[PDB]
From a paper:
[name] and its paralog [name]-A2 are metalloproteases that mediate IGF bioavailability through cleavage of IGF binding proteins (IGFBPs). Secreted [name] is a 1547-residue, multidomain, dimeric glycoprotein which recognizes and cleaves IGFBP2, 4 and 510–17, while [name]-A2 mainly cleaves IGFBP3 and 59,17–21. The proteolytic cleavage of IGFBPs is required for the release of sequestered IGFs to enable their binding to insulin-like growth factor receptors (IGFRs) for downstream signaling. We show that [name] is a flexible trans-dimer that binds IGFBP5 via a 25-amino acid anchor peptide which extends into the metalloprotease active site.
To facilitate the understanding of IGFBP5 recognition, we further obtained the cryo-EM map of substrate-unbound [name] (E483A) at ~3.35 Å. This substrate-unbound map exhibits dimer configuration, but with a much lower resolution for the second monomer (chain A) compared with [name]-[name], and multi-body refinement suggested this should be due to the even larger movement between the two monomers. Nevertheless, we were able to reconstitute the complete structure for one monomer and a partial structure for the second monomer. Same as the [name]-[name], the substrate-unbound [name] structure shows the trans-dimer configuration. To examine whether substrate binding introduces conformational changes to [name], we overlaid the structure of the substrate-unbound [name] with the structure of [name]-[name]. The two structures share the same overall domain architecture and no obvious conformational change was observed in the IGFBP5 binding groove. There were slight differences in some loops around the substrate binding groove, but this is likely due to the limited resolution and the flexibility of these loops rather than representing specific conformational differences. However, there may be subtle differences in substrate binding due to this mutation that we are not able to distinguish. As aforementioned, multibody refinement of [name]-[name] and substrate-unbound [name] showed that in the later structure, the two monomers have more obvious rotation, suggesting the substrate association helps to stabilize the [name] trans-dimer. While we used the catalytically inactive [name] (E483A) for structure work, the Zn2+ coordination remains intact, which is a validation of the state of the active site.
Numbering used by the authors:
A (entry chain A): 102 to 142, 879 to 1263
B (entry chain B): 12 to 336, 403 to 1171, 1186 to 1201
Write the structure that this text describes.
């Protein structure tokens, strides 16, 4: 048999409307014309009577949803159907809220300081009981609290030795994942008559290298269920995984329903390995490959008066080829046909990119510049083929600077300097 | 026969090689031993090749010499090699790595192979360039070349000694340079060595210039130096006891800290009737008893000798400490009613070389009660030095641990917070950022601490420099500023300093006649097949002769050479009314911390307060003059003058107009004008004076010339030093010697042992002997005969060696203790060391430190994107704001606390020159710049390259900058306020981004600062090469990568791996026709069938869940 209760307490001395409808598949309960509960095992209500979801001021009450015209209002928190907007509020229906682009992994195994049959420590494993609203200023924890939660049952309430009892619990997950946030769903807030002050829980994250990273001290309250503790990471430092989460507190009344790690979807720091541009990380192989389905093949590239040495026989994706200039030629490298930083060394690495080359390399000859009085004074340097490498051309000393010698021509040498004048005029 | 040498006086003495040699053209090597005296000309050409006929350009050829770089500021001189072929468009100069040391022999070798120019100083490659290529000159012009030695035609003369001049025709490698270092003329008739001169006869291959101006052929000692006994103190230290090894010897050895009885004398002023004491006998008794009880646990036992001075006039007059000058207060009138401490010391004239005098004077404001004279101070051991204490706080409970603090200050103990709260700026390398022997207090045991009036570990706060959370601070240390009830002990690393300074400086206070031990262990010079040679340093006290009271044995050097400073200064100018820059500051040993920085510890010809308040004092013909007098008149050989600060206009062009030596007979010898620099003291060699000299007169036409000290080196075997008795040494070895030489008096300090056996282990130590009194044994040296050691040419890494170049000399790139030097990299089996930083080649270890070689070091897995657009709050033509665009100029070295920023800073960085310098408006104007980047990306860190720390001379407090990040939506995400320090000039500001909040794309970076002295040469974003917010945007299971549309491609293969699925008694509704990767197909169980799940999702051909309808 299945029973469904109303939404609020009965009001003495009032007229109420009760309607129960059962079609053989679904049964519902209607109070004052409004659907309060249903199971299958702003507003205008044509009245000015409260309790049916719409007040006399035509205002929708809390924990009610009103549709249609005239407005019919029904209860949505706990009805068993997770609507498009119940995720944020209705914990008892949709569980916990997972933001778009995140994944929540709940605790797989748990280790606590005090393990006993009546208060087992493996209750905070798996999905918690989000339908349980926490209890404030609780006196006894023997009713259902130990069923879907954990608490130090073996430890009585301490009055003087409570300052030295360091309660701790460590939760290990099946898989290691980068910790973006820590979810702590509670069932107790730690408030008590004998201990008015609450308890602040400090959470420590344990990595795969057994190192503890402190997340700081954070307060704990019922209004913040589930308690989301962000993981503040220094972006300059490399990311680190996490496999175990440690929760530390001193108040024996602190009971945790569940501990979970909220992480991003993919781009894990496993891909922080040697998987750079030109290759795609494998689905699950602990390694990165470069040819899954990409047809990114670049055509063979040749540079005039230059030396090319490719690291691979074929100029396929990820193939880096070193380019150097012949003696008497300078190296000019332009990334994506644009002016960028040059290469100090005599070799430039060019990588294939989806049928195109990342940078263009040119071995232009070294210009020796137009000669002047620096090389030979009182002379005219008239010569046809410019001032590039190998482009020899002569001079003529004007009157009265008579020139004596067999040769009176220079030659722009391989080091970018004009050759020694074999004859000097006086 | 002993080698000869040439002396060039720098006044016209030059030589030219004859025309019968064919000078090298394609490649060459020059090797020369040279001893350069201080105060050279700029540029003093040691030797160079010059072209006379070619008048269009007269820089053709090469030139080696000494020239000053940064001649505008601090003018420091270095060895330079300059070359310009007949093809290159300019001259190329390569300098040494450090300022040249005067009076020391240097092996200078400059090589050129046709592609590179290399310059080795003492065999270590200190400069390398490759701008010049090709031959130096063609054969046709070969007849128009002249090799000049000692100067050029333009009188770029050289002043000093030259020896063993070798000029080659091929570029000798560093190995051959080192091998040819030791030959000293043992060169065969090679057909490759062009010229080798040992100056047997100058006219064999050289000819003089002018008419008869020729250098002086003299005899030079053939470098008997086999051990570098000159151990330079660290940068932060002041004396030899600050050296790492010398103080480590005291830290480890317990025989170096034997009990010591250190005398001290307490001054008690009395009236003529012996009443009214300054401090009662009870007070002095209590203070002395407490001091003895607090020092006797550190093996020091003070001996008290109270002094009774009965002078009513002195007692009546009020004595004041650190005061600058019954009711008469006229300073001129002798009946004034006040006396400074130094005036009291001058009146008393107490001999402080035998006692630690305690002087009493009121110190009305009491936060530094005890004024102590440091051991390295000039006044440490004379009448005007001692301890100054408040008489009312001398022997009263709660006012007693102030004498121990002053005494510790008098034994060379810095305050424990010296590296934190006693630094001018955060860029000072003397900050104890970590416990070290070379920074701050120079004690490893004392943890860094800030200044604190109370005791107890101070928590985080507004640090003066910017470092918070000091842990394990020595709040209970004596040298801290705690109270008298919570300071209890000296750490057993600060006691070692006290014992070192008692052995070194204060040997006269103690009555025990134990000569100071040899501080450092004997060094194994080399082993033969059956012997060994050991050498050791002189005693730590620095004296070589026995100490005799009233004699000159305390100044005699090793070769009976008497070395003395000035002892009686004078001047015709009336002295300063304030007293600063008095002639008395030009006495004793040099005491200036930094060259050419106007200090009150020198003699300035016009002290005054404001310049040009007095009409020109020094006249045109002769100028002002300082007359120094030496204690012991004698016949001198060399004279050294420490000229510290010279005005910019008088850039060594006659700063010291004359130096007149005054004879005992009264005749005057004029030396003529000299040249002076900052760092190098001006040294002169006096040539056949022939008669005793008692004083000098230094003339000057400069109104800011600051003479710091003087010196008068005597001739060898001076009459005074003959009667001195040299110290002797006794070497003991772990197996006892068969016969023990009772005294090994070796002027080289060398011991040759022949009673050795192969495969055995021996230990050697040295005991000093002064007459019949022995000393504490020197630290033992271990020697395994037939095995390796330090100084054998083989790098045995198991012994801690990192370089071993077969020698025992510092400055060659490998330290004396087989340790690598600073900024020197040593390779090959005999360690050839070269100056790696800046040689144009970036190696594997130069990446993380050499900013100007390898650029900014980007860690693996990251990527630096520099600014592509800039904007500033103040833009001007003189100081443009677009300089920071692009990669920065890493060659620039940061400058701290400089008033003028126009020295090329704007050409490489941006600084706000538009604003005026504010005296009180510095907090009213906020400066900012904003740099936009070409490609916005994630912000992992911000890199800001700085040129200045933004510190002013009048503001010791540093500056802080606030950096803000702007995302693609122009939202300011502040990164925090960060201090400005040039010890980490590439400023890395990490980004602390919470992992829950989605990452943004930073478009621009905004950086704000207050003071206008801050200069930025570039702002960049350090970001991950891979990963981005685009991955988090929309890329689910099966979406690998799409084109540039901030998305991933949904169908990238894996569309046929999953075969057709069949479920019994179930209905399949497939959204997609083909069961591709992650395909969704709803499964509905028929009526009466229970649904079991283990919408199914395909996963690489395998269904993620199993659906059945039972
Ligand atoms: Zn002090």
């Amino acid at each position: 048999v299945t029973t469904i209760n109303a939404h609020r307490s009965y009001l003495p001395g009032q007229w109420v409307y009760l309607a129960a409808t059962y079609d053989g598949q679904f049964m519902k309960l209607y109070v004052n014309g409004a659907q309060v509960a249903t199971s299958g095992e702003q507003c205008d209500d044509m009245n000015k009577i409260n309790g049916d979801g719409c007040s006399l001021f035509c205002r929708q009450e809390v924990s009610f949803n009103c549709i249609d015209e005239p407005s019919r209002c029904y209860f949505h928190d706990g009805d068993g159907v997770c609507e498009e907007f119940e995720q944020k509020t209705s914990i008892k229906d949709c569980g916990v809220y997972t933001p778009q682009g995140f994944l929540d992994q709940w605790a797989s195994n748990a280790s606590v300081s005090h393990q006993d049959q009546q208060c087992p420590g493996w209750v905070i494993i798996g999905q918690p009981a989000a339908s349980q609203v926490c209890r404030t200023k609780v006196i006894d924890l023997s009713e259902g609290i130990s069923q879907h939660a954990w608490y130090p049952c073996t430890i009585s309430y301490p009055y003087s030795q409570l300052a030295q009892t360091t309660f701790w619990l460590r939760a290990y997950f099946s898989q290691p994942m980068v910790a973006a946030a820590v979810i702590v769903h509670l069932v107790t807030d730690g408030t008590y008559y004998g201990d008015q002050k609450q308890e602040t829980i400090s959470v420590q994250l344990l990595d795969t290298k057994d190192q503890s990273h402190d997340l700081g001290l954070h307060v704990l309250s019922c209004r913040n269920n589930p308690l989301i503790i962000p993981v503040v990471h220094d972006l300059s430092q490399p990311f680190y995984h996490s496999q175990a989460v440690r929760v530390s507190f001193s108040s024996p009344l602190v009971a945790i329903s569940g501990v979970a790690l909220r992480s991003f979807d993919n781009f894990d720091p496993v891909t922080l390995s040697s998987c750079q541009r030109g290759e795609t990380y494998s689905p699950a192989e602990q390694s990165c490959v470069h040819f899954a389905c990409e047809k990114t093949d670049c055509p063979e590239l040749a540079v005039e008066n230059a030396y090319l040495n490719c690291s691979s026989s074929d100029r396929y994706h990820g193939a880096q080829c070193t380019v150097s200039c012949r003696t008497g030629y300078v190296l000019q490298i332009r990334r994506d046909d644009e002016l960028i930083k040059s290469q100090t060394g005599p070799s430039v690495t060019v990588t294939c990119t989806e049928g195109k080359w990342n940078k263009q390399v040119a071995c232009e000859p070294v210009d020796c510049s137009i000669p002047d009085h620096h090389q030979v004074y009182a002379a005219s340097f008239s010569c046809p083929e410019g001032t590039t490498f190998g482009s020899q051309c002569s001079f003529q000393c004007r009157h009265p600077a008579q020139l004596k010698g067999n040769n009176s021509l220079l030659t722009c040498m391989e080091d970018g300097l004009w050759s020694f004048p074999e004859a000097l005029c006086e």
